[model samples]
Structures are given as C-alpha cells and as structure tokens.
Target: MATEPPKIVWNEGKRRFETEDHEAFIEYKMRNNGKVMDLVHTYVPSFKRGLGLASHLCVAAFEHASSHSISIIPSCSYVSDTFLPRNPSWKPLIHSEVFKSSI
Candidate 1:
C-alpha cells in the first residue's frame, strides 16, 4: 500500500514542520547572511525515527535552499550521515571537506 507523504508546514514563527499529530515535528534553524541562508539544525523526534521522516526533512530543506539559491551546511549528523548518502546530488551544497576530515 502506498502512503502519502506527510504534509510539511513551515512554521516561520517556530521554525519547523508541524506533522498531522502536531506533537511530532522536524526541527530546523536557518542562519541568514543577507540573502544567503544556511540551514543549521535538522532534527526529528526519536519516536518519529525509522519512518524516513528525517529524509523528508532533508528534502524540504534542500527544496527551500534551491528556491532561495543558497548553499547548505548540514550541521545535523542525521541529515549528513544518513540522508546525504541517499541523495548525493545535494552533495555539492554541502561543505565536503568537513565531512571528509571528520572521517
């Protein structure tokens, strides 16, 4: 059975997504330098784990970045380690040396 992807609502007031349950969320922080935006922390709740929620968050972040034409610095390990491997096209947006040097 195919399930619909969760609706992503950007709460500019709180700076995160509000899932259907409302309690669950994908949190992110954006650092803006003039016209540039850097998506900082991307986190999903533990109970929300294993359902590809993090991946969805990454997708939303990337889409936002593309729309705004800003590079990303994925400080969050979940989005960097897990999400990036699956979506390599977003690699150029990442600071490659940071991840490489950490390994």
Candidate 2:
C-alpha cells in the first residue's frame, strides 16, 4: 500500500502550517495562556484564488484545533463568511460576538 503524502506540515521557522506548494498558509495567534489559539489567518496566492484553497485552509485549521484541543477565531473574512456557512460543524469553535462584530 502506498502511503499518502501529508496535506499540511507545520513550519517551525514560520510558526504555521502550510501546503506543499506553499501557495496557501495559516497563521495561528494564541492567547496569553497558550491554551487557546484565538485567531487563525489563512491566505492563498492570487493565482490560486477561486480554487477553494480558503475552504481547505479553514477545514485544516479547524481540524488542527480540534486535535490540539484549542479554539479558533477566524479573523480571515473568507473563513468567517464563506467557509462557516458551508461547514456548520466547526461553528461552535467560533467566537460568536467576534463573528457578529466582524459583520
């Protein structure tokens, strides 16, 4: 059986997880306690736009958060507006007032 390649890898130098192509990246901002990741910002290169990279990043970020037992604040509008509507399961991790204030 062939092993699948990892979809994302954490870059210790950059302090974030990224795709193999580096076309997309996520920046996680943690709280003072370090127990919670208050914000996750994902960005995709312009050439990769409209390819669902943002959605992939959101899902990846939420999965990472779940595995690590951390919460998330989706500072990226793409995640806040688009991704959440499509993936309601991850909504509970979102900070409600922050989401409301953002809109």
Candidate 3:
C-alpha cells in the first residue's frame, strides 16, 4: 500500500521544499527580486518513489506561489513534464514570458 506523504516544509535557508524528514524535496531559485520562483529540481528517496510524494511536493510549491503572487518557471523536468500535465489548472501559474532572457 502506498503511504500518504508527510507535510512538506519550505526550507527557505536551503531554497527547497522538503518533507519533514527530508525524504523528498523540491528546490527552486528566486528570480525577479522574489517575484518568480524557478523550480529547478525535485528529489524523492528511491524507496519513497511512486508514492505521489513528488506531487505532494509540487502542490506545496505551487500553492506557495499562488499565495505570494509569484510566477513560476518549472525548470525541473518532473514538474514540467509530469506534474504540469497532470495538473493543467496550475498552468496559469507559469511565468507568462515565452522566453527567459535573463534566467
């Protein structure tokens, strides 16, 4: 049986969102003077994979973005390729620019 993922934590000091035990995390870089959150990476321990922990992590990041009025750039492949497709409603949260000139 798949276990429910733990509550995710935003580790501001590390610029990552992580589970309470640090078993899973999504990392991001701030851009545009804190107006953008460039989600750069995500990780879940091998044993914790397929438990939907990745999605859980993304929900935290996305919700945080929404609440803060911040745009997101899903530089992480998993977020762009997987999570975004599964969660189309979140697409509007993506950065509006078609090109990223300044990173």
lDDT of each: 0.61, 0.66, 0.71
- The residue-by-residue lDDT of candidate 1 on 1-103, one tens digit each, is 4253677777888766666545555555656652334555555667776777756666666677666776766656566676667667666555642365333
On TM-score, the stronger of 1 and 2 is 2
Winning model by lDDT: 3
* Preferred candidate (TM-score higher): 2 or 3: 3
Q: Which stretches of candidate 3 lie over 4 Å from their true place?
A: 1-5, 95-103
lDDT of 1: 0.61
Whole-model lDDT for model 2 versus the true structure? 0.66
Clashing pairs in 1: none
Model 2 vs. true fold: TM: 0.74
Candidate 3 lDDT over 1-103, as tens digits, reads 4254486878899888988668789988778998888877777898668877776776677778878878787766465566666666556667422233224
Per-residue lDDT, model 2, residue 69, is 79
Candidates ranked, most accurate by lDDT first: 3, 2, 1
Q: Considering summed lDDT, which 10 consecutive residues are worst modelled in model 2?
A: 94-103
Q: So what's the TM-score on candidate 3? A: 0.77
